[PDB]
């Protein structure tokens with residue numbers, strides 16, 4: 001599910017940015 | 020939130036494996 005991964009990556013990527 | 024990212028990465032990583 002590449003699409004699911006992409007969405008999750010955003011959350012993980014965004015979460016990392018937040019701290 | 021590195022910890023949040025790690026958890027999300029697993030979901031994204033696992034999701035990718037599923038397809």
Ligand SMILES: *Cc1cccc(C*)c1
Pocket residue numbers: 008009010012013027028029031032
């Ligand atoms: C979007 C993403 C890139 C590299 C590693 C993770 C877990 C997520």
